[PDB]
Structures are given as structure tokens and as C-alpha cells.
Amino acid sequence: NQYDTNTTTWSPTGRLFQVEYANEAVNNGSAAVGTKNKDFVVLTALKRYQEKVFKLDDHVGMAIAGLVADGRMLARFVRTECMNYRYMHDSDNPLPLIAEIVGEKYQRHIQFAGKRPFGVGLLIAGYDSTGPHLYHTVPSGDVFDFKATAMGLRSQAARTYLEKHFESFPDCGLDELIMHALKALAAATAELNIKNTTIAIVGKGTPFMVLTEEAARKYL
Amino acid sequence: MASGGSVIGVKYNGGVLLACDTLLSYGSLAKWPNIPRMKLVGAYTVMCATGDYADFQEMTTMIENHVNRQQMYGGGALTPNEVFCYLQRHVYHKRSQFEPCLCRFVVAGCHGGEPFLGGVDDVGTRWTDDCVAAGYGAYVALPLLRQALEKPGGLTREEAIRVIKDCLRVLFYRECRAINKFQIADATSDMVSIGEPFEVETNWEYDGFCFEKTAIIR
């Protein structure tokens, strides 16, 4: 295949091949799941001790899938954007604006020869003046706003489960929502417990937080 | 070096008033008596400043643009508190380069039925409070607004207007570079409105001001 070495080469059917391959890096990381009700977002992730969930500011964090060194870069970047914002404004970086700028950073790495794609997907979960928000970012620079989804390996199954249940999630409380996020992450698999499964939460009243093994015992 | 004189502001029950005159001076020359010095910034907020009018124009332009662009590109409508914070950072930054904004700002607004009022000076000092002022307002007005606010339970809109006008009258009497022509903005119910100019009634007819009593030589 002549058309699949660089990012700066279209193919005769209007495809960018190197970009689809970066996208496989995501389909082959460990599964993560997100879901949201009226006032919280829950991330869960199946650790395959590997940092897979990062806090980006008081009101927002993310799960990754794929190349971790890419995840860490995208984190230094968002953290520095939120801090800047709060220095200038004394309030929280709004979440739609976080998504835009991540999207654009990714896109620049798919259009020049001196930049490599990012081989890492994010589930960004946060909470601001317009409620909770769950964004998915992929290496093509696309940015979806979801009520629920899953990424990474076997994560189709997680996706199927969620598809039957998400309509009920607006009404759920924070405990059923966490359980739905686990039955989903389970569907992508050894079983879940406090040494290989992460849970994080953010919402009204609730700065972004990874549950400790104690608090997580209740759910697991 | 078109320059603005005093600005004053006071909080009352339900909102806040900002007032100034419509004059730009150049040194002692009263050069433009019909300039509207107050600027609406976004949905909830209004600003004014004492000092160098060019530096005020530049700083409010920069701010109004951030506020309008942020709103238009999906990041919502900045609040008084946020506008104020951003202002103070830019004032401070410029001071830190030794290229100061030679103004003193007063900012006012109303969001969530909570009225804002605060001040920023040209080295970046900031404070909020129930009454703020700049220029000879700080020496002449604040003693009166502060006395007025001593009453418990706060001020009605009408009592806030009365005391704003008494301050205006003293500025007009004792501030050289002033004129009897003023506007008042009123932040209340999550929006600001700027009134038409008005004048205050003054007194000039005391017997102790007559020619014979003020004569240096009898």
C-alpha cells in the first residue's frame, strides 16, 4: 500500500490511512466506560497498577485508552489550560471549551509531517454551570458528546449493554449509575474488584475524585 | 491626555448604582463636556474609570472583546466577578512590565440577584465593598456613602439616589475639573441600564458669600 506511511498523504478514495491506524491504538487499550445522569458523571476503567484515570482540575478528569505517554501529554496540556483559565477568571474552565481545544490539538498532529498522531482516546468527564458532560476524543480529532459510551478492547460489548439501559440513566441515583457503569465494564471481560477496577465521579457538590479501595468496596 | 474625573458607586437592596460626569479634561482645560464615560461589558456588567481615557478605551476594548467572543463561541456569558478578575490580572501584568494602565476602575453589575461592586487601582490593588469610588470621589464621596450605609438593613433605591446626588453636588462644588452633568447606571434584575444626563441643584446665595463680607479690605 503506497498511501499509508505518512499523515500528509490522502489515498485515492479519500481516506487517511495513518490516521485509522493511530485509531487502532485505542481499540487495543483496556476498556473504559463512562455514563451520566442529571447531576453526575461516572468513569470506570479496567486496569490491565497502571494509571488510566487522571484529574485535570477541581471539576474535570479523564480516562485514557492506548498509548499512555500520549495520555500524559494531553493531561499536562489540559491541566495547564484549566489553571490558566482559573487564574484569569476565578471560575472553572467551561467544559465545551476544553473539548474544542483538545480536538484542535489532535487535528494539528494529523496534518503536518513534523507531527505524529496521538494514539490515545479520552473520555473526559466534568461538571460546570451547564451540568454534567461526557466527551469522547479520538485521534482523528473528532469529539463526541455522549450520554454513555465505552472505548478500548472488547468495548463493543460494554457498548451493547449501555444501549439497552441509558434511557433510564436520567432518573437514576448516583448508586445505580455507578452500578450500570460496572455491569457495562464487566461486559468487556477475571472479574472486577478493588485492585483492578477504577471508579471516578464528578458532579454537583462533587469535585472530581477517584474512589479509594474503601469507598469502592461498597460497589464492588 | 484626555482624562476623566471622579466615579462613584453604591450598593442598595436589590442592586447597585454607578455614577459619573460626562467630561474629559486635558490638564485644567474642560475639553469635552459630552462624553459618556460608562461602558457596558457583557450582559451584567458596567465599568468606568478615573484617569487616562486612552488607557480606559484600550482596556475596555480588550475586555469587551473577550467577553463577546467567549459568548459567541460556546463558552457562556461572563459574570461581573469573572470580568473583574480578568481586568485585575491585566492591570497587574502591565504594571509588572512598567507600562501601566494609568486608570483606576470601578466595576458594577448584577447576576443571580447578587450585586457586585469593586475597584482596581493602577498597580493592581483590588477590593469589593458596599461603596467604592475613584478620583476625588474617594476623599469627598466615600465619607457620605459610608455614613449612609451605617443604617441597619441597608438602603432603598430612592435613598441610594438621594445620597448619590449629595455626593455629586459636593464634587461639583469642590472638584476643580468637573461639570454639573452626570449619568447614573443602575445594575438590578440581572441587567444594567444607563440613564440620561442630569444636573443637581446647587447653592450659591448664602449671606456669608456676599461681596461685603468676603471683601479683603473695608
Coordinates of C-alpha atoms in Angstrom, one line a residue:
Chain A
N1 CA 0.0 0.0 0.0
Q2 CA 1.6 3.2 -1.3
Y3 CA -0.7 5.5 0.6
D4 CA -0.2 4.6 4.3
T5 CA 3.1 5.8 5.5
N6 CA 2.6 9.5 6.4
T7 CA -0.3 11.5 7.7
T8 CA 0.1 14.0 4.8
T9 CA -1.0 11.6 2.1
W10 CA -4.6 11.2 1.0
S11 CA -5.5 8.0 -0.7
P12 CA -7.4 7.8 -4.0
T13 CA -10.7 7.1 -2.2
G14 CA -10.2 10.0 0.2
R15 CA -9.0 8.1 3.2
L16 CA -6.3 8.9 5.7
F17 CA -4.7 5.6 6.5
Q18 CA -2.1 6.5 9.0
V19 CA -5.0 8.1 11.0
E20 CA -7.0 5.0 11.1
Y21 CA -4.0 3.1 12.4
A22 CA -3.5 5.5 15.2
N23 CA -7.2 4.8 15.9
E24 CA -6.4 1.1 16.3
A25 CA -4.1 2.1 19.2
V26 CA -7.3 3.0 21.0
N27 CA -9.2 -0.1 20.1
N28 CA -6.5 -2.2 21.7
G29 CA -6.1 -0.5 25.1
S30 CA -8.0 -1.6 28.2
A31 CA -11.7 -0.8 28.2
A32 CA -13.1 2.2 29.9
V33 CA -16.7 3.3 30.3
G34 CA -18.5 6.5 31.1
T35 CA -22.1 7.3 31.9
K36 CA -24.1 10.3 33.2
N37 CA -27.4 11.1 34.9
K38 CA -28.8 14.6 35.6
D39 CA -26.0 15.7 38.0
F40 CA -23.1 13.3 37.9
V41 CA -20.7 11.6 35.5
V42 CA -19.1 8.2 36.3
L43 CA -15.9 6.8 34.7
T44 CA -14.9 3.2 35.2
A45 CA -11.8 1.6 33.9
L46 CA -10.4 -1.9 33.8
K47 CA -6.7 -1.6 34.8
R48 CA -4.6 -4.1 32.8
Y49 CA -1.0 -0.9 38.7
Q50 CA -1.4 1.3 35.6
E51 CA -2.6 5.0 35.8
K52 CA -5.6 5.1 33.5
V53 CA -7.7 7.9 35.1
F54 CA -6.3 11.5 35.6
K55 CA -7.7 14.5 37.3
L56 CA -7.5 17.7 35.2
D57 CA -8.9 20.3 37.6
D58 CA -11.3 20.5 40.5
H59 CA -14.2 19.9 38.1
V60 CA -12.9 17.6 35.4
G61 CA -10.9 14.4 34.7
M62 CA -10.5 11.7 32.1
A63 CA -9.9 8.0 31.4
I64 CA -7.5 7.0 28.6
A65 CA -7.1 4.2 26.2
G66 CA -4.0 3.4 24.1
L67 CA -0.5 5.0 24.4
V68 CA -0.1 6.3 27.8
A69 CA 2.8 8.6 27.0
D70 CA 0.3 10.4 24.8
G71 CA -2.3 10.4 27.5
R72 CA 0.2 12.1 29.8
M73 CA 0.9 14.8 27.3
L74 CA -2.7 15.6 26.7
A75 CA -3.0 15.8 30.5
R76 CA -0.2 18.3 31.0
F77 CA -1.9 20.2 28.3
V78 CA -5.4 20.4 29.7
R79 CA -4.2 21.0 33.3
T80 CA -2.3 24.0 32.2
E81 CA -5.3 25.3 30.3
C82 CA -7.6 25.0 33.3
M83 CA -5.2 26.6 35.6
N84 CA -4.7 29.4 33.2
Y85 CA -8.4 29.9 32.9
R86 CA -9.0 29.9 36.7
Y87 CA -6.1 32.4 37.2
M88 CA -7.7 34.7 34.6
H89 CA -11.4 34.3 35.7
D90 CA -11.6 32.8 39.2
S91 CA -14.0 30.2 37.9
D92 CA -14.0 26.8 36.2
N93 CA -12.8 26.3 32.6
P94 CA -16.2 25.5 30.9
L95 CA -16.3 22.0 29.5
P96 CA -17.3 22.7 25.9
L97 CA -14.1 24.9 25.6
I98 CA -11.9 22.0 27.0
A99 CA -13.3 19.7 24.3
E100 CA -12.7 22.2 21.5
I101 CA -9.1 22.8 22.3
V102 CA -8.2 19.1 22.8
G103 CA -9.9 18.4 19.4
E104 CA -7.8 21.1 17.7
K105 CA -4.5 19.9 19.3
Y106 CA -5.2 16.4 18.0
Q107 CA -6.1 17.7 14.5
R108 CA -2.8 19.6 14.1
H109 CA -1.0 16.3 14.6
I110 CA -2.8 14.7 11.7
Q111 CA -1.9 17.4 9.1
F112 CA 1.8 18.2 9.2
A113 CA 4.9 16.0 8.5
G114 CA 6.7 17.1 11.7
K115 CA 3.9 15.8 14.0
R116 CA 2.8 12.3 14.8
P117 CA -0.9 11.4 15.5
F118 CA -1.8 10.9 19.1
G119 CA -2.6 7.2 19.7
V120 CA -4.8 7.7 22.7
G121 CA -8.5 8.1 23.2
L122 CA -10.1 10.1 26.1
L123 CA -13.3 10.0 28.0
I124 CA -13.5 13.5 29.5
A125 CA -15.9 13.8 32.3
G126 CA -16.8 17.0 34.0
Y127 CA -19.3 19.3 35.7
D128 CA -19.8 23.1 35.3
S129 CA -22.5 25.8 35.3
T130 CA -24.4 23.9 32.5
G131 CA -24.4 20.5 34.2
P132 CA -22.5 17.3 33.6
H133 CA -20.7 16.4 30.4
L134 CA -19.0 13.4 28.9
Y135 CA -16.8 13.8 25.9
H136 CA -15.0 11.2 23.8
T137 CA -11.9 12.3 22.0
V138 CA -10.3 10.0 19.2
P139 CA -7.0 10.5 17.2
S140 CA -8.7 11.8 14.1
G141 CA -9.6 14.9 16.2
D142 CA -13.3 14.0 16.5
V143 CA -15.1 15.0 19.7
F144 CA -18.3 13.4 20.6
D145 CA -20.7 14.5 23.4
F146 CA -22.3 11.3 24.8
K147 CA -24.9 10.2 27.4
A148 CA -22.9 7.0 27.7
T149 CA -20.1 5.1 26.0
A150 CA -17.1 2.8 26.0
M151 CA -13.8 2.6 24.5
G152 CA -11.0 0.1 24.1
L153 CA -10.8 -3.6 23.9
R154 CA -14.0 -5.7 23.6
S155 CA -15.6 -2.4 24.4
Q156 CA -18.3 -3.1 21.8
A157 CA -19.9 -5.4 24.5
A158 CA -19.9 -2.6 27.1
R159 CA -21.5 -0.5 24.3
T160 CA -24.3 -3.1 23.7
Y161 CA -25.2 -3.3 27.3
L162 CA -25.3 0.5 27.7
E163 CA -27.6 0.7 24.6
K164 CA -30.4 -1.2 26.5
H165 CA -30.2 0.9 29.7
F166 CA -29.0 4.5 29.0
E167 CA -32.6 5.8 28.5
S168 CA -33.2 5.1 32.2
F169 CA -30.0 6.9 33.4
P170 CA -31.5 10.4 33.6
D171 CA -33.6 9.3 36.5
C172 CA -31.1 7.0 38.3
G173 CA -29.3 8.0 41.5
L174 CA -25.6 8.1 41.9
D175 CA -25.5 4.5 43.2
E176 CA -27.4 2.8 40.4
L177 CA -25.5 4.9 37.9
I178 CA -22.2 3.6 39.3
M179 CA -23.5 0.0 39.0
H180 CA -24.6 0.4 35.4
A181 CA -21.1 1.6 34.7
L182 CA -19.8 -1.6 36.2
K183 CA -22.1 -4.1 34.6
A184 CA -21.0 -2.4 31.3
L185 CA -17.3 -2.6 32.1
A186 CA -17.9 -6.2 33.2
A187 CA -19.5 -7.0 29.9
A188 CA -16.0 -6.2 28.4
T189 CA -14.2 -9.1 30.1
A190 CA -11.2 -12.4 35.6
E191 CA -13.8 -10.3 37.4
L192 CA -13.9 -6.8 38.9
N193 CA -12.6 -5.9 42.3
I194 CA -10.7 -3.1 44.3
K195 CA -7.3 -4.0 42.8
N196 CA -8.0 -3.9 39.1
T197 CA -11.0 -1.6 38.6
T198 CA -11.2 2.2 39.0
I199 CA -14.2 4.3 39.7
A200 CA -14.3 8.1 39.4
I201 CA -17.1 10.6 39.8
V202 CA -17.8 14.2 39.3
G203 CA -20.9 16.3 39.6
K204 CA -23.0 18.8 41.6
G205 CA -21.4 19.3 45.0
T206 CA -18.7 16.8 44.0
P207 CA -15.2 17.8 42.9
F208 CA -13.7 15.1 40.6
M209 CA -12.5 12.1 42.5
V210 CA -11.3 8.6 42.2
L211 CA -12.9 6.4 44.9
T212 CA -10.4 4.8 47.3
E213 CA -10.5 1.0 47.8
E214 CA -12.6 1.5 51.0
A215 CA -15.4 3.5 49.3
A216 CA -15.2 1.2 46.3
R217 CA -15.7 -1.9 48.4
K218 CA -19.4 -0.9 48.8
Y219 CA -19.9 -1.1 45.0
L220 CA -17.6 -4.0 44.2
Chain B
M1 CA -4.1 63.2 27.6
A2 CA -7.8 63.4 27.8
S3 CA -8.6 62.4 31.3
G4 CA -11.8 61.5 33.3
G5 CA -12.5 62.7 36.9
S6 CA -14.4 61.1 39.8
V7 CA -16.6 57.9 39.6
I8 CA -18.7 56.7 42.5
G9 CA -20.8 53.7 43.3
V10 CA -23.1 52.3 46.0
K11 CA -24.9 49.1 46.7
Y12 CA -28.6 49.2 47.7
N13 CA -31.2 46.5 48.4
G14 CA -31.7 44.8 45.0
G15 CA -28.8 46.3 43.0
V16 CA -26.1 48.9 42.6
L17 CA -25.6 52.4 41.3
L18 CA -22.6 53.8 39.5
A19 CA -22.3 57.5 38.7
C20 CA -20.1 59.9 36.9
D21 CA -19.9 63.1 35.0
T22 CA -19.6 63.4 31.2
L23 CA -16.4 65.4 31.0
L24 CA -12.9 64.7 29.7
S25 CA -10.3 67.2 30.6
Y26 CA -6.8 68.0 29.4
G27 CA -4.9 69.3 32.3
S28 CA -7.1 72.2 33.5
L29 CA -9.0 72.6 30.2
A30 CA -12.5 71.2 30.1
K31 CA -12.3 69.9 26.6
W32 CA -15.3 67.6 26.0
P33 CA -18.4 68.1 28.2
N34 CA -20.5 65.5 26.4
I35 CA -18.6 62.2 26.7
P36 CA -20.4 59.0 28.1
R37 CA -17.7 57.5 30.3
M38 CA -19.5 54.3 31.4
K39 CA -19.2 51.2 29.3
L40 CA -21.4 48.1 29.3
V41 CA -19.4 44.9 29.3
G42 CA -21.4 41.9 28.5
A43 CA -24.9 41.1 29.9
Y44 CA -24.5 42.0 33.6
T45 CA -21.6 44.4 34.0
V46 CA -20.7 48.0 33.6
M47 CA -17.3 49.8 34.1
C48 CA -15.9 53.2 34.5
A49 CA -12.5 54.8 35.4
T50 CA -10.7 57.8 36.6
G51 CA -7.5 58.7 34.8
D52 CA -6.2 58.4 31.3
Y53 CA -9.1 58.0 28.9
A54 CA -6.9 56.3 26.2
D55 CA -5.9 53.6 28.7
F56 CA -9.5 53.1 29.6
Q57 CA -10.5 52.7 26.0
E58 CA -7.8 50.2 25.2
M59 CA -8.6 48.1 28.3
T60 CA -12.3 48.0 27.9
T61 CA -11.9 47.1 24.3
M62 CA -9.8 44.1 25.1
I63 CA -12.2 43.1 27.8
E64 CA -15.4 43.6 25.8
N65 CA -13.9 41.5 23.0
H66 CA -13.0 38.6 25.3
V67 CA -16.5 38.7 26.8
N68 CA -18.3 38.9 23.5
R69 CA -16.1 36.3 21.8
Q70 CA -16.4 33.8 24.6
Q71 CA -20.2 34.0 24.5
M72 CA -20.4 33.6 20.7
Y73 CA -18.0 30.6 20.6
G74 CA -20.0 28.5 23.1
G75 CA -18.3 29.4 26.4
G76 CA -21.3 31.3 28.0
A77 CA -21.7 34.8 29.4
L78 CA -19.1 36.0 31.8
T79 CA -20.3 37.4 35.1
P80 CA -19.2 40.5 37.0
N81 CA -17.0 38.6 39.2
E82 CA -15.2 36.9 36.3
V83 CA -14.9 40.2 34.4
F84 CA -13.4 41.8 37.4
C85 CA -10.9 39.1 37.9
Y86 CA -9.7 39.3 34.3
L87 CA -9.4 43.1 34.5
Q88 CA -7.2 42.9 37.6
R89 CA -4.9 40.4 36.0
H90 CA -4.3 42.7 33.1
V91 CA -3.8 45.8 35.1
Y92 CA -1.3 43.8 37.2
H93 CA 0.6 42.4 34.2
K94 CA 1.1 45.8 32.7
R95 CA 2.3 47.2 36.0
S96 CA 4.7 44.4 36.0
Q97 CA 6.1 45.4 32.6
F98 CA 6.4 49.1 33.7
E99 CA 3.8 50.1 31.1
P100 CA 0.9 50.7 33.5
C101 CA -2.7 51.4 32.8
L102 CA -2.9 54.8 34.4
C103 CA -6.5 54.5 35.5
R104 CA -8.5 53.5 38.5
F105 CA -11.5 51.4 37.7
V106 CA -14.9 50.9 39.3
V107 CA -16.9 47.9 38.1
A108 CA -20.5 47.1 38.9
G109 CA -23.1 44.6 37.9
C110 CA -25.8 42.2 38.9
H111 CA -26.0 38.4 38.4
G112 CA -28.2 35.9 40.3
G113 CA -29.8 38.9 42.2
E114 CA -26.4 39.5 43.8
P115 CA -25.0 42.9 43.0
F116 CA -21.3 43.4 42.5
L117 CA -19.2 46.5 43.1
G118 CA -15.3 46.6 43.2
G119 CA -12.3 48.7 42.4
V120 CA -9.0 48.2 40.8
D121 CA -6.1 50.6 41.0
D122 CA -3.2 51.1 38.6
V123 CA -0.8 48.9 40.4
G124 CA -3.4 46.0 40.5
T125 CA -4.9 46.6 44.1
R126 CA -8.5 45.2 44.2
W127 CA -11.3 45.3 46.6
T128 CA -15.1 44.9 46.7
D129 CA -17.4 46.7 49.1
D130 CA -20.7 48.5 49.6
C131 CA -19.3 51.7 48.3
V132 CA -16.4 52.3 46.0
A133 CA -15.1 55.5 44.3
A134 CA -12.3 56.8 42.2
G135 CA -10.6 60.2 42.0
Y136 CA -11.8 62.9 44.3
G137 CA -14.7 60.6 44.9
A138 CA -12.6 58.6 47.3
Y139 CA -12.0 61.7 49.5
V140 CA -15.3 63.5 49.1
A141 CA -18.0 60.9 48.4
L142 CA -17.0 57.8 50.5
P143 CA -17.4 59.7 53.8
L144 CA -21.0 60.3 52.9
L145 CA -22.0 56.9 51.4
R146 CA -20.3 55.2 54.3
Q147 CA -22.3 57.3 56.8
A148 CA -25.5 56.5 54.8
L149 CA -24.9 52.7 54.9
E150 CA -24.4 52.8 58.7
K151 CA -28.2 52.5 58.9
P152 CA -29.2 48.8 59.6
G153 CA -30.9 46.7 56.9
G154 CA -29.3 48.8 54.1
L155 CA -30.6 51.4 51.6
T156 CA -33.7 51.5 49.4
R157 CA -33.2 52.6 45.7
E158 CA -34.5 56.0 46.5
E159 CA -32.3 56.7 49.5
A160 CA -29.3 55.5 47.4
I161 CA -30.2 58.0 44.7
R162 CA -30.5 60.8 47.2
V163 CA -27.1 60.2 48.7
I164 CA -25.5 59.7 45.3
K165 CA -26.8 63.2 44.4
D166 CA -25.5 64.9 47.5
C167 CA -22.0 63.5 46.7
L168 CA -22.3 64.7 43.1
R169 CA -23.1 68.1 44.4
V170 CA -20.1 68.3 46.6
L171 CA -17.9 67.1 43.7
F172 CA -19.3 69.8 41.6
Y173 CA -18.6 72.3 44.4
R174 CA -15.1 71.2 45.4
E175 CA -13.5 69.4 42.5
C176 CA -11.9 71.8 40.0
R177 CA -12.2 69.7 36.9
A178 CA -15.8 68.8 36.8
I179 CA -19.1 69.9 35.5
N180 CA -22.7 69.8 36.6
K181 CA -23.7 67.0 34.3
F182 CA -23.9 63.4 35.3
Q183 CA -25.2 59.9 34.5
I184 CA -26.2 57.1 36.7
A185 CA -26.1 53.5 35.8
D186 CA -28.3 51.0 37.8
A187 CA -27.5 47.3 37.9
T188 CA -30.6 45.4 39.0
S189 CA -32.6 42.3 37.9
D190 CA -29.6 40.9 36.1
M191 CA -29.1 43.8 33.7
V192 CA -27.6 47.2 33.6
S193 CA -29.3 50.4 32.3
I194 CA -27.7 53.8 31.8
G195 CA -29.8 56.9 32.5
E196 CA -29.9 60.2 30.5
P197 CA -27.7 63.0 31.9
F198 CA -29.0 65.2 34.6
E199 CA -27.9 68.1 36.8
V200 CA -28.0 68.6 40.6
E201 CA -29.3 71.7 42.4
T202 CA -26.6 73.8 44.0
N203 CA -26.5 76.7 46.4
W204 CA -24.7 80.0 45.9
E205 CA -26.7 82.6 47.8
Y206 CA -25.6 82.5 51.4
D207 CA -25.2 85.8 53.1
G208 CA -21.6 84.9 54.1
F209 CA -20.9 84.7 50.3
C210 CA -21.9 88.3 49.7
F211 CA -19.5 90.9 48.4
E212 CA -19.1 93.0 51.5
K213 CA -18.4 90.1 53.9
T214 CA -15.8 88.5 51.5
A215 CA -14.0 91.8 50.8
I216 CA -10.4 91.6 51.9
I217 CA -10.2 95.4 52.6
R218 CA -13.0 97.5 54.1

